[PDB]
């Protein structure tokens, strides 16, 4: 299908794979409100994105994805300034073992908050029409990385919550879709297009690796 | 190796599976510092416990596993009383989806904090002697529960952190072992305390996930 017209919210996209994601969506005809607190990097990201895209299809917001109030405000501003929402990308994350409290409050808590907000603003039952919510993870959620325990715990929690809430939505008949991405950056953003362009792929985990390009792991 | 004369600390033993754990230890002679938050369910457990075992082999300290200032003081007083520490058991848990913050703060954060405190108090690198640390998870950490996503998050996080910290301490040459056990839907509650002892028995196992199912009995996760 054509992703044109749709509205998307990608979290933490001022630099890196996050930013990459936006490009694809912007080049696919959608309109993206990048969300990240890296204002110095986010403004430059929007500037770079503009040169090949009309400036009304790129917005930016500043909110660290750790507080429910700020995340809710960001979602409200997205759906207001654009009128709706169809695509959610929860990818903001930090790699750190020392202050593992933050490592666990960022990767796992904020993904759940974002998915609940996406269900709220997209669940057929309570308005809207649905769409898709994708959470970004890594092999640490599927492999034990002895080097970084808390990282492995966060990724495992994400890859559990994704399936749980996908089953919940599928039982509630709410339109919202949930999927999880666990790769080994343009090839990474080539996964959003692969997943979003098929409504028969919900509540699953996909892997991007050098062995098989893009594929899906079967439980 | 030997279980007699050791010292163990099980969190949340005022009732249920927790209690089973404690009792089994006193069958094998290990001295135990019970910990839980429901003091009402704890004092009765203590009274029923010292009946079959000498008064001086057990103690109880009431605290929540999520308050760091309390989980440090519990370990400190336990070491002060028994003079050592060898076995740690993180069993505190709750099912709740309304205040979904607390499910994670309890099932996941408290386990990690207790494990780190135990490693500090047991690792050969800092004047300890060694022992074992054990964490309680469930099949929720290995299969999706429809209505309880935060519970799955906590269980999965515990599985990962155990399997990682075990190897982290193993390669450092610390001596301590870390493992996590998962029971079935409770299945005789004794069957879980019949498992805890097993972990303290064997010494060639580190970071093993034990699963209980009523079709084959007891097995371990495959990776
Ligand atoms: N580490 C890796 O190599 C892999 C990572 N991923 C996913 O990609 C994410 C990052 O990938 P990278 O390309 O390495 O980018 P990165 O981690 O270097 O980029 C982080 C960007 O997001 C922002 N950010 C991070 N956490 C945030 C938070 N809690 N609140 C607000 N802004 C936040 C940072 O300011 C920065 O703008 C990881 O979190 C994970 O989701 C996926 C597979 C492998
Ligand atoms: N609930 C069940 O029947 C089953 C439990 N499990 C696993 O076994 C663990 C123990 O469950 P049960 O013994 O059946 O529970 P229970 O319903 O018999 O009692 C819960 C125990 O946890 C303690 N506890 C709860 N939150 C605590 C906290 N924040 N700090 C300290 N202690 C706390 C309570 O004091 C009580 O001792 C569960 O956490 C779960 O990991 C798995 C399968 C079935």
Numbering used by the authors:
A (entry chain B): 1 to 184, 222 to 256
B (entry chain A): 1 to 186, 220 to 256
Copy out sentences from the published article reporting this entry, exactly as the authors wrote them.
The enzyme 15-prostaglandin dehydrogenase (15-PGDH) is a key negative regulator of tissue stem cell activity in proliferation and in the repair of tissue injury, whose negative regulation of tissue regeneration is conserved across multiple organs. 15-PGDH acts via its NAD+-dependent enzymatic activity of oxidizing and degrading prostaglandin E2 (PGE2), and related eicosanoids, which provide key trophic support for stem cells in multiple tissues. Specifically, 15-PGDH catalyzes the rate-limiting step to initiate PGE2 degradation by oxidizing the 15-hydroxyl moiety of PGE2 to a 15-keto group, thereby inactivating PGE2 from being able to bind to its receptors. 15-PGDH assembled as a homodimer, which is the proposed physiological form of the enzyme.
To further define the predicted functional role of the 15-PGDH drug binding lid, we employed cryo-EM to solve the structure of the 15-PGDH-NADH complex in the absence of inhibitor. With a similar imaging processing workflow, we were able to resolve the apo-form to 3.3 Å. The cryo-EM map of the unliganded 15-PGDH shows clear differences from the (+)-SW209415-bound complex described above. In the absence of inhibitor, 15-PGDH forms a looser complex that lacks certain structural features because of enhanced dynamic flexibility. These features are apparent in the 2D class averages and localize mainly to the lid region of the inhibitor binding pocket. Thus, the MD simulations recapitulate the cryo-EM findings that the lid becomes disordered in the absence of inhibitor binding. In the absence of an inhibitor, our data indicate that this lid of 15-PGDH successively swings between open-and-closed states in solution.
